Design a protein around this ligand. Sequence first.
Ligand SMILES: O=C(O)C(F)(F)C(F)(F)C(F)(F)C(F)(F)C(F)(F)C(F)(F)C(F)(F)C(F)(F)F
Length: 133
Amino acid sequence: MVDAFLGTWKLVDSKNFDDYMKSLGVGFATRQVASMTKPTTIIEKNGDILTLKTHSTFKNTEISFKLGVEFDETTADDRKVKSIVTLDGGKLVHLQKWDGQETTLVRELIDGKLILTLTHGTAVCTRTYEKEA
Ligand SMILES: O=C(O)C(F)(F)C(F)(F)C(F)(F)C(F)(F)C(F)(F)C(F)(F)C(F)(F)C(F)(F)F
């Protein structure tokens, strides 16, 4: 059910990312670098285990998880969160919880592009990724 998300994806559009980062308390200097970074996201599957890599000239992350099973995560901005990823309406929904706060990272395929919607507080960011061959 996750299979159309798998592969290597490159950032090609970003809307409201500074709002999202600011809502999370990211400092201005980090926001400035991040606003000019174009990550590569790699999503791979081995049986029930997904691995999601995010690579850039600034911050690099990797998580592995089973759909529907909570996992500990340390985010790129150093938040220590409780996470769960699940398919919902064909979208890959990643929920992070910490300190009573939540943020969602929702991935949906639209016309072959991967649209990542990031919500925290009132901030809603949309990032578009295109598949690499
Ligand atoms: O995958 C993406 O496109 C993505 F990198 F934007 C992300 F992973 F979704 C993200 F969650 F938004 C995030 F990692 F960029 C963050 F949460 F904004 C962040 F950690 F705060 C950061 F911007 F990376 C910071 F530099 F502050 F550390």
